[PDB]
């Protein structure tokens, strides 16, 4: 029936219905066809389909995290030794209810996380996430004053994409390069960052220059933010500053070339430590440091 | 819900409202005691018979109480504390009326799995236990705190206003095996009188007293062993609102000199609220106490603030009646006493 | 070679009781092997193996007590349950496992001496002893007193 | 009853928080103490191998021997003079060497087991089940848990890597031995050592016996060896409520350098190692030892020289004081590998409430 093909069908779609929540919805559809009653026939084939999904992954982490939560919920269903049919019906229904929960959480956060942006504050935003931009839009809906500074992120020219999406709202902006980002931290009140993953330790899994932002802000004593939806938690512990799951290059040094083809290669995903984050915002209340780990301990029961 | 129903039966609501607004009531410890006696009067007098209608009414009363006074966090916390004590016993009661409920530990994840009696008596005793907890905090502090400070070590102290901290310091000085020098920042616009009484009580017990002007803090930081905070209210992220003047700079001075920072507090003093902005939470003072004459005060726009905030980046320990905790853990202590719903009243 | 099932058919049924030697842990539950019904894998889930913290309990140790829930008689997929087995039945599960272990020890000297496959020797024994008499242990006790 | 008071060397003007004394050579004692305790106390007084982890394992086995040797009196029941006898053991252990955290959790477990079993069951039937339970308890919490630490570390360490270590931690010796033999990688292991005990020397010796590429160094020379180093493993003793690393001597120095020089510190730990006592500096509660171990002039433990130093009591202020157990600062370590898999030291007490 395929799961990778179902995820590939979301091209012109996206937004509101997030990338992990679309992968979880694809997991439920694959589950509900071939009988969820048998725990031997099904769970092994679910594990093989997740393994096939990881093998097809080029540069994504959150899909592996979203599978875990699904699994957990499935196992927790028949924890009460209930009817092997009513528990199954509740499991299949919690697929559309999972995607509906992405709406309710966004409704919660955009009313909680507007409080952090005070009267007339200049913001420097880096790493686009659906939660952080939803804060930015629903604060403009609240009729509050805020200035915005665009960071020139270089994965697939994300800065320009961010700049255009800010233009469609009615908030004054200008381009700032990630090289010169050090020269901005004095006229900026607060620095906001949207995450691709949050660590077991309390650190962050993010894009092509976020650790660099974290350190500079720690030097300038100016606050550093993480805002996300509560599903991007893996049991991952990057021990060092440059160690991450990759399908591509971990810093390659190429031979002598004249035609100029082999060059670009640099760490596209970078880690930052727990100390650099001043504040974290999710739908699971207002909490930052060890909170993430408590969540993970609460899930894994280990 | 308004106070139209509770007027002849309950009068003490409005006298507490009057005590807050004009600041007749003073010190978080006292504000807590009054709200306890308010909730004592609310249960003893009212007639409800229904439980969910009762709890939501209490929520609205607490919502109005915090809107009446924003700096009364001890007011807000005490209500929230009883609210959670109520909610657990109701959830225990609903399990018996319907008829594994014990997975492993007491976690969170309220987004995963779905769901006449002596309940009022439990509510009564729940208030009584809160009083006794607020009555005795010092006993729970001294067993953790008087283990960390050494002989020939110099202690610098902002906020001499706290009754909690001074009594912690006197129990340590009672130990003849422990010797320490005390530096006290004055905190000019507000703390002055309290700082002078602080210096008097230290001399009364014969402890090496040193009165420091708020300018001289830097001129001593090389010699300072430890820093102690007399906080009013502690928060989720770790940070504190303290009892007025000259703390933030001292903490900044300590961190640059890498001098350790201590904090003495209670769990009722601890708040489940989050300080997203200091701009809203901090209360400002009266500039009358700075500069005389009003015709120059047209041009002399003077700035003075009472409450001072410290970010969590500085302090390391919050010694309570329970124990010593790190700012990166204090949120759990909070959630052990207050529920997630019991925040936005 | 150590193979061939203790009973007549390859795959178990519903309500029948078995004994497992643990070979796996965490995530799902445990892909393992049995000591009561064949040597092939039969999986269980964490919830079943808990009832009642857990990081000191099983961890592929000795033997437990489990009852078969779901059997796939097509390719080979077995589901089990630990909690469901009652305290009075646990003693009976242990005695059947002890009986199965004695039958397996008996049908191993035969394969060693004459150098012939164990599965053929297990098939020729399990027709009057296991099916008609009741069990192979009590039939062996009858054979030693009077053939 | 025992020997108390009258101590060698000066009382000292600075650092006088703990006892500096005790019985090395056996003279004047009670004639009821079990000899396996008397052996362990004589061992730990001048021990070269042990460091937190192995001390408790030996303490458990000694207890198992005592229970096996224990025959219940006809008049007095099982919970009558046992707990007094155990209190005599701990007091003799305290006189020899200050106890670890893991030792305390063992005693607490044993005292819980005394209360659990009521004097009504037969004597031989009781102790047979007791020692079986202790054996299973030691299997789970130590041996199996250790194996769990092994595999958790195995995923974390990259292929062909340089590791700098310190101490004589049982968990790390087995870790590196597992790396050299089972996984077969290019592991360059550098070991550091202090003056009071040649713990790292012994570790390096055992690694050499396995056949490992080993460099051996000292604290004095570090700004040369580092300028190479990737992951640094530290031998845990106890992690407190805050998340401070209470460990051996030359630990914090290494921890500082690693934080400064990019590639950080990792720590392997046991679920039994965590305490609830908290502190912030090394002065608080230090494991002090007699300057008799620092008399020797370099090279080895027994050399016996007519050197430069000799006097301590008669000399007008000459405090040659050394410490054994120190505190690493909170932020500097990054990983902790325990029974419950993983977690940063910022989290710390997510195991104490989980029990």
User: What is the rounded CA–CA span in Å between residue A106 and residue A125?
Assistant: 19
Cβ-based contacts of D272 with chain C (< 8 Å): none
User: What DSSP letter does each residue of D296-333 carry, written as one string?
Assistant: S-SS-S------S---SSSSSS-----BS-EEE-TTSE
Q: Which of C75, C107, C137 is nearest to C2 (CA)?
A: C107
Between CA B228 and CA B253 the distance in angstroms is 13
Contact A33, A88 (CB under 8 A): no
**Residue B149 backbone phi and psi in degrees, to 5:** -105, 135
Which pairing describes strands B153-157 and B226-229: parallel, antiparallel, or unpaired? Answer: parallel
Maximum alpha-carbon separation in chain B: 77
What is the full DSSP assignment across A41-77?
TTHHHHHHHHHHHHHH-SS-SHHHHHHHHHHHHHHHH
Work out how many CB contacts closer than 8 A connect B with C: 5
Please give the DSSP secondary-structure letter assigned to residue A129. Answer: -
The HSE-up count of residue D215 (CA atoms within 13 Å, CB side) is 17
Look-up of token digits 């360059």? D188
d(C-alpha A160, C-alpha A182), whole Å: 20
- Contact call for D144 and C56, based on CB within 8 A: yes
Q: A273 with A182: CB under 8 angstroms?
A: no
Gyration radius (Cα) of chain A, Å: 21
Q: Indicate the helix (H) or strand (E) that contains D95.
A: helix D82-96
Separation in Å, CA D116 to CA D59, D111, D112, D126, D161: 21, 9, 6, 12, 49
Take residue C147 and report the two structure tokens written for it: 């053939």
Q: What secondary structure does DSSP assign to C96-144, as a single string?
A: HHHHHHHHHHHTTHHHHHS---HHHHHHHHTTIIIIISS-HHHHHHHHH
B276 contacts A116? CB cut-off 8 A: yes
**B83-106: b (≥16 Cβ within 10 Å) or e:** bbbbeebbeeeeeeeeeeeeeeee
Question: Which DSSP helix (H) or strand (E) runs through D116?
Answer: helix D101-116
D231-239 and D245-247 strand pairing:
antiparallel
Report how many Cβ contacts below 8 Å link chain B to chain D: 40
| Nearest to B143, CA basis, from B6, B287, B323 | B323
Residue contact B331–A299, C-beta within 8 A: no
The CA angle B177-B179-B185, to the nearest 5 degrees, is: 150
The strand pairing partners of A125, in sequence order, are A150, A192
Taking CA B17 as the corner, what is the angle to CA B15 and CA B23, rounded to the nearest 5 degrees?
100
Cβ atoms of residues D169 and D235 within 8 Å:
yes
Check: CATH 1.20.140.10 for C16-88? no
Torsion angle of C-alpha atoms A277, A278, A284, A286, degrees rounded to 10: 180
Nearest to B269 by CA among B68, B48, B76: B76
Candidate from A41, A47, A76 with C-beta closest to C77: A41
DSSP characters for A168-205?
TTT----EEESSGGGGGTTT-SEEEE--SEE-SSS-EE
> Closest Cα of chain B to A112: distance in Å?
10
CA–centroid distance for A58 within its chain: 16
Tokens 């096996």: give the residue: D68
The residues that bridge with B240 in the sheet, in sequence order, are: B234, B310
How far apart are alpha carbons B237 and A290 in whole angstroms? 10
The string of DSSP letters for B23-80 reads T-S-SHHHHHHHHHHHHHHHHHH-----SHHHHHHHHHHHHHHHHH-SS-HHHHHHHH
Residues near A107 by beta carbon (within 8 Å), at least 6 away in sequence: none
Specify the fold of A103-299: Rossmann fold (3.40.50)
**A116 contact B CB<8A:** yes
Backbone angles phi, psi at D342, to 5 degrees: -130, 170
Q: What residue segments make up the domains of chain B, in order of their start?
A: 9-135, 137-336
- Residues B99 and D81: their CA atoms lie apart, in Å, by 49
CA of D127 to nearest chain A CA: how many angstroms apart? 32
Residue B176 burial (10 A CB sphere; 0-12, 13-18, 19+): exposed
User: CA triplet D84, D85, D88: central angle to 5 degrees?
Assistant: 90
Helices (H) then strands (E): counts for chain C:
4, 5
- A275 contacts in D (CB within 8 Å)? 331
- Report chain A residues whose CB lies below 8 A from the CB of C70: 37-40
Query: Radius of gyration of chain D from Cα atoms?
Result: 22
Distance from the Cα of C58 to chain D's closest Cα (Å) equals 9
**Cα D129 to Cα B122: distance, rounded to the nearest angstrom:** 43
The SS3 of residue B310 is strand
Inspect the interface and report whether the beta carbons of A39 and C83 lie closer than 8 Å. Answer: no
Measured between CA atoms, how close is B324 to chain C, in angstroms? 26
Mutate to test the interface with D, among C22, C26, C56, C58 (most CBs of D within 10 A): C56
Q: To which H or E segment does residue B330 belong? A: helix B330-335
Instruction: State how far the Cα of B197 lies from the Cα of B191, in Å rounded to an integer.
Output: 10
Gap between the Cα atoms of B89 and D285, Å rounded? 43
CB D67 within 8 A of CB D86: no
**3-state DSSP call for residue B263?**
strand
B188's CB contacts (< 8 A; 6+ apart) are B214, B245, B246
Rounded distance between C-alpha atoms, residue A47 and residue A259, angstroms: 45
d(CA D347, CA B329): 7
Residue D314 to residue B20: CA distance in whole angstroms: 69
Q: Say how many Å lie between the first and final Cα of chain C, rounded.
A: 29
- Cα Rg of chain C (Å, integer): 17
Give the strand pairing for B153-157 and A270-272.
unpaired
DSSP string, C49-69: TT----TTS-SS-SB--EEEE
CA dihedral B286, B291, B297, B302 (to 10 degrees): -60
Q: Is the Cβ pair C53, B102 closer than 8 Å?
A: no
> Which structure tokens are listed for B285?
């003072």
Q: Which of D76, D10, D69 is nearest to D35 (CA)?
A: D69
| Inter-chain residue contact B329 with D349, CB threshold 8 Å | yes
B137-336: which CATH topology? Rossmann fold (3.40.50)
CA distance B114 to chain C (A): 17
DSSP for D204-264? HHHHHHHT--EEEEETT--TTT-----EEEEEEEEE-SS--EEE-STTHHHHHHHHHTSS-
- To which H or E segment does residue B142 belong? helix B138-145
Across the interface, which of C46, C55, C70 has its CB nearest the CB of A40? C70
Residue whose entry in the numeric block shows the structure tokens 């209340």: A285
How many CB atoms are located within 10 Å of the residue A114 CB? 19
Q: Can you tell me whether residue B199 is helix, strand or coil?
A: helix
The rounded distance, in Å, linking the Cα atoms of B222 and D52 is 36
Nearest chain D residue to A294 by CA distance is: D350
Paired tokens of B83: 């609210």
Nearby residues of D348 by Cβ (< 8 Å), 6 or more positions away:
A290, B326, B329, D239, D240, D241, D242, D243, D274
Residue of A nearest to D152 (CA): A237
Tell which residue, A188, A194, A115, A114, has the closest CA to residue A147. A188
Show me where the domains of chain C are located. Answer: 16-88, 89-147
Say whether residue B188 is in contact with chain A using an 8 A CB cutoff: no
Cβ neighbours of residue D343 under 8 Å, at least 6 residues apart? Answer: A200, A201, A237, A293, A297, D336, D350
Chain D environment of A300 (Cβ under 8 Å): 341
3-state DSSP call for residue A260?
coil
Beta bridge partners, A146, equal: A121
Rounded CA separation A239/A59 (Å): 20
Tell me which chain A residue has its CA closest to the CA of residue B333: A291
Chain C CB contacts of D354 under 8 Å are 53
Q: What angle do CA B77, B80, B81 make, to 5 degrees?
A: 85
Q: What are phi and psi of A25, to 5 degrees?
A: -65, -35
Residue D107 corresponds to which tokens in the numbers above? Answer: 């005693």
Beta bridge partners of C29: C45
Whether C75 has its CB under 8 Å from any CB of chain B: the answer is: no
Alpha carbon D264 to its chain centroid, in Å, reads 23
Superfamily of domain B9-135: translation initiation factor eif-2b, domain 1 (1.20.120.420)
**Closest Cα partner for D107 from D124, D87, D123, D126?**
D87
State the first-to-last Cα distance of chain A, in angstroms, to the nearest integer.
34
Per the DSSP assignment, residues forming a β-bridge with A121 are A146
Q: What distance in Å separates the CA atoms of residue C28 and residue A300, rounded to the nearest whole number?
A: 12
Centre a 10 Å sphere on the Cβ of residue A10 and count the other Cβ atoms it contains: 14
Give phi and psi for B227, each to the nearest 5.
-120, 135
Across the interface, whether the CB atoms of A41 and C72 are under 8 A apart is answered yes
State whether A274 and D264 contact (CB < 8 Å).
no
Cα gap D56→D43, rounded to integer Å: 13
CA distance A245 to A234: 12
Q: Does A43 touch chain C (CB under 8 A)?
A: yes
Residues of chain D with C-beta less than 8 angstroms from the C-beta of B148: 278-280, 284
Chain C contact set for B105 (CB, 8 A): 53
For chain A, say whether C53 makes contact (Cβ under 8 Å). Answer: yes
Alpha helices in chain A (DSSP H): 4-8, 19-33, 43-56, 62-77, 86-93, 96-112, 130-140, 158-167, 211-220, 291-300
Burial per residue of B122-156, b for 16 or more beta-carbon CB atoms within 10 angstroms, e otherwise: bbeebbeebeeebeebbebbbebbbebbbeebbbb
Q: B178: which chain D residues are within 8 Å (Cβ-Cβ)?
A: none
Residues contacting residue B208 through CB under 8 Å, at least 6 positions apart: B180, B181, B182
CA dist B152 → A60, B179, B224, B259, D294 (Å): 56, 6, 11, 15, 28
Tell me, what DSSP letter sits at residue D99?
P
CB D187 within 8 A of CB D179: yes
With tokens 């932002």, the residue in question is A213
* Closest by Cα among B183, B156, B159 to B306: B159
Distance CA(C130)–CA(C147), nearest Å, equals: 16
For Cα atoms D182, D185, D187, give the angle at the middle one, nearest 5 degrees. Answer: 115
How many interface pairs between A and B have CB atoms less than 8 angstroms apart? 55
CB-hemisphere CA count at 13 Å for B88? 15
Cβ neighbors of D265 (< 8 A, separation 6 or more) are D232, D234, D254, D255, D258, D259, D328, D332, D333, D334
Q: Could you tell me if A189 and A222 are in contact, meaning their C-beta atoms sit under 8 angstroms apart? A: yes
State how far residue D327 is from chain B, nearest Cα, in angstroms. Answer: 13
Chain D residue numbers touching C22 (CB-CB < 8 A): none
- Listed residue (A225, A203, A270) closest to A109, CA to CA: A225
Number of neighbouring beta carbons within 10 Å of residue B194: 20
CA-wise closest residue to C44 among C21, C74, C62, C10: C21
CA atoms in the 13 A half-sphere facing the CB of D88:
16
Distance CA B77, CA B62 (A): 9
Token pair for B46: 């009212």
For residue D340, give the nearest of C55, C57, C59 by CB distance. Answer: C55
Question: Reduced to 3 states, what is the DSSP secondary structure of residue C70?
Answer: strand
Of the options 3.30.450.20, 3.30.10.20, 1.10.150.190, 3.40.50.880, the CATH number for the domain spanning C89-147: 1.10.150.190
Does B112 lie at the interface with A, CB-CB under 8 angstroms? Answer: yes
Give the list of residues 6+ apart from residue D243 with CB closer than 8 angstroms, or none: B326, B328, D330, D344, D345, D346, D347, D348
Among the listed residues B272, B281, B275, the one whose alpha carbon sits nearest the alpha carbon of residue B306: B281
User: Are the beta carbons of D192 and D200 closer than 8 angstroms?
Assistant: yes
Measured between beta carbons, the chain C residues lying within 8 angstroms of D339 are: 55-56
Q: DSSP letter at D98?
A: P
First to last CA, chain B: 12
């Amino acid at each position: 029936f395929n799961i990778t093909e179902t995820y590939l069908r979301f091209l012109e779609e996206d937004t509101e219905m997030t990338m992990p929540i679309a992968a979880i919805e694809a997991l439920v559809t694959l589950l509900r066809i071939k009988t969820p009653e048998t725990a031997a026939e099904m769970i092994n084939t679910i594990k093989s389909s997740t393994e096939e999904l990881i093998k097809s992954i080029p540069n994504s982490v959150s899909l592996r995290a979203g599978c875990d939560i699904f699994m957990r919920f499935v196992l927790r269903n028949l924890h009460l030794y209930g009817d092997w049919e009513n528990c199954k019906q509740h499991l299949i229904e919690n697929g559309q209810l999972f995607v509906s929960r992405a709406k309710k959480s966004r409704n919660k956060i955009a009313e909680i996380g507007v409080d952090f942006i005070a009267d007339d504050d200049i913001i420097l935003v880096h790493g686009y996430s659906r939660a952080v931009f939803s804060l930015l839009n629903h604060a403009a809906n609240k009729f509050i004053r805020f200035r915005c500074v665009v960071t020139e992120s270089r994965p697939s020219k994300q800065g320009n994409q961010l700049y255009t999406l800010l233009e469609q709202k009615g908030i004054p902006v200008t381009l700032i390069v990630d090289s010169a980002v050090g020269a901005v931290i004095d006229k900026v009140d607060k620095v906001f960052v949207g995450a691709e993953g949050v660590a077991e330790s309390g650190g962050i899994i993010n894009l092509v220059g976020t650790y660099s932002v974290g350190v500079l802000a720690h030097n300038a004593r100016k606050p550093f933010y993480v805002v996300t939806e509560s599903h991007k938690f893996v049991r991952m512990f990057p021990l060092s500053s440059d160690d991450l799951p990759m399908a591509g290059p971990p810093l390659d040094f190429t031979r002598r070339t004249d035609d100029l083809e082999d060059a670009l290669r640099g760490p596209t995903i970078d880690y930052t430590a727990q100390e650099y984050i001043t504040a974290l915002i999710t739908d699971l209340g207002v909490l930052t440091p060890s909170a993430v780990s408590e969540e993970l301990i609460k899930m894994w029961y280990d | 819900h308004p106070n139209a129903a509770t007027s002849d039966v309950n009068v003490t609501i409005d006298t507490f409202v009057a005590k807050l607004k004009r600041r007749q009531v003073q010190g978080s410890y006292a504000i807590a005691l009054e709200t306890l006696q308010l909730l004592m009067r609310f249960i003893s007098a009212a007639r409800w018979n229904h439980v969910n209608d009762l709890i939501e009414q209490i929520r609205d009363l607490g919502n109005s109480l915090e809107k009446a006074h924003p700096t009364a966090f001890s007011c807000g916390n005490v209500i929230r504390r009883i609210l959670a004590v109520l909610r657990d016993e109701v959830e225990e009661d609903t399990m018996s009326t319907t008829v594994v409920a014990e997975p492993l530990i007491s976690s969170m994840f309220n987004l995963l799995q779905k769901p006449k009696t002596d309940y009022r008596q439990v509510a009564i005793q729940g208030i009584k236990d809160l009083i006794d907890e607020i009555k005795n905090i010092d006993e729970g502090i001294q067993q953790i705190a008087i283990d960390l400070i050494h002989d020939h070590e110099i202690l610098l102290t902002p906020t001499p206003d706290s009754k909690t901290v001074l009594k912690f310091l006197i129990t340590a000085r009672e130990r003849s095996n422990r010797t320490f020098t005390v530096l006290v920042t004055e905190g000019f616009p507000n703390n002055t009188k309290n700082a002078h009484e602080f210096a008097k009580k230290l001399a009364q017990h014969n402890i090496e007293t040193l009165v420091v002007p708020d300018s001289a803090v830097f001129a001593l930081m090389s010699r300072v062993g430890k820093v102690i905070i007399g906080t009013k209210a502690v928060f989720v992220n770790g940070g504190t609102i303290s009892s007025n003047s000259g703390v933030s700079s001292v903490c900044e001075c300590a961190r640059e000199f890498r001098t350790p920072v201590f904090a003495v507090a209670g769990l009722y003093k601890l708040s489940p609220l989050y300080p997203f902005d200091v701009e809203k939470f901090v209360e400002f003072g009266g500039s009358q106490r700075i500069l005389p004459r009003m015709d120059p005060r047209k041009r002399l726009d003077t700035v003075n603030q009472i409450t001072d905030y410290v970010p969590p980046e500085n302090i390391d320990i919050y010694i309570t009646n329970v124990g010593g905790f790190n700012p990166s853990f204090i949120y759990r202590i909070a959630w052990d006493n207050y529920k997630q719903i019991d925040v936005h009243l | 070679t150590s193979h061939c099932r203790f009973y007549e058919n390859k795959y178990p049924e519903i309500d029948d009781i078995v004994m497992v030697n643990v070979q796996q842990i965490a995530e799902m539950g445990a892909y393992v092997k049995l000591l009561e019904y064949d040597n092939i894998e039969g999986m269980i889930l964490l919830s079943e193996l808990s009832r009642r913290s857990i990081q000191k309990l099983i961890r592929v140790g000795k033997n437990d007590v489990a009852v078969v829930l779901r059997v796939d008689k097509e390719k080979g997929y077995i589901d089990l349950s630990k909690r469901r087995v009652s305290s009075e039945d646990i003693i009976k599960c242990e005695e059947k496992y002890q009986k199965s272990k004695t039958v397996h020890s008996i049908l191993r000297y035969c394969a060693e001496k004459f150098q012939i496959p164990l599965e053929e020797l297990y098939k020729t024994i399990a027709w009057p002893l296991s099916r008609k008499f009741g069990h192979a242990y009590e039939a062996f006790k009858l054979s030693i007193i009077d053939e | 009853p025992g020997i108390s008071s009258v101590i060698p060397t000066v009382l000292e003007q600075s650092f006088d928080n703990s006892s500096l004394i005790s019985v090395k050579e056996l003279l004047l004692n009670k004639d009821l103490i079990h000899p396996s305790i008397l052996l362990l106390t004589s061992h730990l007084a001048h021990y070269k191998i042990v460091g937190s982890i192995p001390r408790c394992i030996a303490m458990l086995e000694v207890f198992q021997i005592v229970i096996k040797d224990y025959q219940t009196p006809k008049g007095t029941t099982l919970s009558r003079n046992l707990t007094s006898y155990l209190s005599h053991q701990i007091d003799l252990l305290k006189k020899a060497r200050p106890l670890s955290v893991t030792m305390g959790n063992a005693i607490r477990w044993l005292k819980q087991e005394i209360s659990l079993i009521d004097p009504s069951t037969p004597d031989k039937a009781a102790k047979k089940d007791l020692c079986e339970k202790i054996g299973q308890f030691a299997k789970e919490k130590i041996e199996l848990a250790d194996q769990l630490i092994i595999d958790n570390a195995s995923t974390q360490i990259e292929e062909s890597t340089t590791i700098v270590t310190y101490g004589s931690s049982k968990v790390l010796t087995e870790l590196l031995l597992h790396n050299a033999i089972s996984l077969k990688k290019n592991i360059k292991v550098i070991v550091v050592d202090s003056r009071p005990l040649f713990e790292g020397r012994k570790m390096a010796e055992t690694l050499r016996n396995a056949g490992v590429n080993v460099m051996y160094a000292l604290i004095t020379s570090l700004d040369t060896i580092f300028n190479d180093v990737d992951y640094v493993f530290l031998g845990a003793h106890s992690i407190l409520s805050n998340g401070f690393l209470y460990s051996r001597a030359g630990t914090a120095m290494l921890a500082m350098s690693a934080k400064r020089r990019n590639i950080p510190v990792l720590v392997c730990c046991e679920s039994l190692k965590f305490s609830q006592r908290v502190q912030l500096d090394s002065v608080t509660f230090n494991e002090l030892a007699d300057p008799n171990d620092l008399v020797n002039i370099d090279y080895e433990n027994p050399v016996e020289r007519r050197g430069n130093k000799g006097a301590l009591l008669n000399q007008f202020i000459k405090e040659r004081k050394f410490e054994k157990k120190k505190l690493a600062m909170e932020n500097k370590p990054k990983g902790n590998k325990i029974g419950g898999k993983k977690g940063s030291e910022g989290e710390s007490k997510d195991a104490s409430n989980e029990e």
